[PDB]
Design a protein around this nucleic acid. Sequence first.
RNA 1: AUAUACCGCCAUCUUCAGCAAACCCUGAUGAAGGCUACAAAGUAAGCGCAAGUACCCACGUAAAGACGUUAGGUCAAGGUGUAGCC
Lengths: 322, 217, 63, 132
Amino acid sequence: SFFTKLTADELWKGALAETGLNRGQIIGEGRYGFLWPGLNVPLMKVQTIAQRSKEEQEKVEADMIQQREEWDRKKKMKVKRERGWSGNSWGGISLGPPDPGPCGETYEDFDTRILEVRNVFTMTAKEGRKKSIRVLVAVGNGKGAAGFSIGKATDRMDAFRKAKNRAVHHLHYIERYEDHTIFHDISLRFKRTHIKMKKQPKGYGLRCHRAIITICRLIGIKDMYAKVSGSINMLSLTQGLFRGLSRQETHQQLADKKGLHVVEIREECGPLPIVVASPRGPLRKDPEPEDEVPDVKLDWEDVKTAQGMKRSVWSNLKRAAT
Amino acid sequence: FNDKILNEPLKHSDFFNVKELFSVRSLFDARVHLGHKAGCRHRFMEPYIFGSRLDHDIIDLEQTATHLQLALNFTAHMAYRKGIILFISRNRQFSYLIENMARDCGEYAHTRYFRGGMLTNARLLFGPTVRLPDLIIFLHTLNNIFEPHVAVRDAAKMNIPTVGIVDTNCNPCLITYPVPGNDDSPLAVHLYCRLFQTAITRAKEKRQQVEALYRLQ
Amino acid sequence: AGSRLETVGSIFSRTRDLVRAGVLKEKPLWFDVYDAFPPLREPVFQRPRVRYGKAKAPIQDIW
Amino acid sequence: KNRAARVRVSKGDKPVTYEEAHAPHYIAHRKGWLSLHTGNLDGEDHAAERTVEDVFLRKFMWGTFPGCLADQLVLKRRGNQLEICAVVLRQLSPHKYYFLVGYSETLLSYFYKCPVRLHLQTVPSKVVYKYL
RNA sequence: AUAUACCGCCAUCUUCAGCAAACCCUGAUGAAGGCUACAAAGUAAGCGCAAGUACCCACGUAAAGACGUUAGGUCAAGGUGUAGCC
Ligand SMILES: [Mg+2]
Ligand SMILES: [Mg+2]
Ligand SMILES: [Mg+2]
Ligand SMILES: [Mg+2]
Ligand SMILES: [Mg+2]
Ligand SMILES: [Zn+2]
């Protein structure tokens, strides 16, 4: 009957089943050809109640068919989503610049990239499996300063903004020998993860781990060799990357911890001894005790490469351009 | 553009002449040299120990005077720079004094139970725009349980410099201007509330002096 | 922005460095006074390690 | 859990109205009856059809004012006179609203044989009571 | 035909007191955790208890009882997804 008919909200509620349409119809159209002086006409001026013909109606009813279909083809569009480290994986996915604060304090230079997503679970008292999503981002604008923090919430979209708005408040200033690299070959361990990270000249490209590519492009470091061994757990890699990029001795510090001028020799150059840093203040008249072959406990994987005995079919690969 | 009264007293050294308000004789008779026993003597405080006379650690007052002059120099420049100044203490013996000290000067205090996250959740626990207190003075860096007070770790995090009266129990690593001294004896704190009040009351009237000088100019 | 790492450097080593990368659009007001009268110690956080072997405290006893 | 008229709280992003933010044991305490006729007294007749006259109008006006009928209707009756108080949206042009006032006030009046007298009230947005 | 697609109306724990968005901290920034009034990190809109309201009182019995638990129950109240018969 008539009273069995009902409103629209109780229709989609019953059909979508999220508990475990009306945009084109203007109020003046009717299926029978009809006009009224109130609406569907030149307003108040045709001023007579009159009807249409039949095949004119067959021209405007066919129009409604092409409007809905074109609007439905606009619903059926594949978004040109940027591929971060793979398809169907929130790897190096770029979010927008992070959100402005409650007074001002814009962050328009910064960029946020995801590092790892994880559908983490915990069996709770009532509900059972409580799925939360545990995301990890890194902030950085180039320019030597960066940071990273984690987000953990019950939804995908809400956990991202947690991690963005945290990491802009947790920043390091990663210093650089002029922009493209670091100061010395540094090798550390963050609880299990031996990371060897050595300084490289220009043009080398970021031949380093898939995370560390998409972190140093946010710091500005353009090329550096970084072999990570042991365990590769994405959060423990990044907290090992960030300390040894901060526990870092600039050339003005290497002087001022020792006095003496720091000289550098470039192989593509001659023996031209360019000073990079002199100490701010005194100068020591004692040259260094040049004890050769010192007890610097060097690695093993650098000697086999400097000897060139060993080999790997993935040792030197013609990979793409970062 | 009135940076000419702001750029001047950093080139000066001891612009307030705060060194006339304290001396090593005047410090000793406030018993600032006394400390706790030699069991709970903190490992980061052994630079600031004179020695252990009969299981009692005495503080180098020649090292306090080169700290107290550098500590009272800081708080005098900042009250001159109309900065906001707090006083955090949790001893319950001087909770009347360091509050009544703060009412005597023009600065603020917080002498009771620190609600967890008062500085780091400031824009929610207070209104959405709040001027953070750009100096913090500790008179007891310990709680009523002898743990470092929680504001020594939040003021480091919220990036505002803190001064303190660091004793033989506590950790001076996060206090940006340590003063090694006694704090649990009342004649210490009567002089300790004396020097941190005089140095900022002179700092207020010195600010009002120089501004009318360039306003008469 | 801010940087609330109380371990990776002191509050001067961050506030000098976050204004060298230019992320802070205005310096704090205490910043120039540390640039005028620095303390005798760099206030960085160090973990309190504990004496184990033949390594006592280098203090003396007053007699 | 009874689920009569209670909108469920799920997030703070559903704007609820004052008539919808009350559970149906509040019909005398914090609400009133949306309609008004003398049917359900004791003991008086003409209650049986006067609800069928009542449920028809709340299924009619929601059609002819589509997407712009903000809250529920107030269907009163004073003898051979019935007023319709009605809150609407300020989105449609007032040449079309007056056309609907003049059309419906002479349509149902010849249908139920009584002077129907619709009187409108405009609110621009939805009067949100709680953000659950 | 399918309550093992659902709305709609409910049963149960419920004669409960919890659930919670949003931020902050602690765990070397791991799953997570966040209690100490002579107080060591929590703050909290919002919901429910409570409080008000009905009945003969402020008592009482009603009414109320969130989020969830059992693919609880109902296509046979009505509507309706999918598949079917015409
Ligand atoms: Mg793919
Ligand atoms: Mg019940
Ligand atoms: Mg009952
Ligand atoms: Mg109740
Ligand atoms: Mg079942
Ligand atoms: Zn003490």
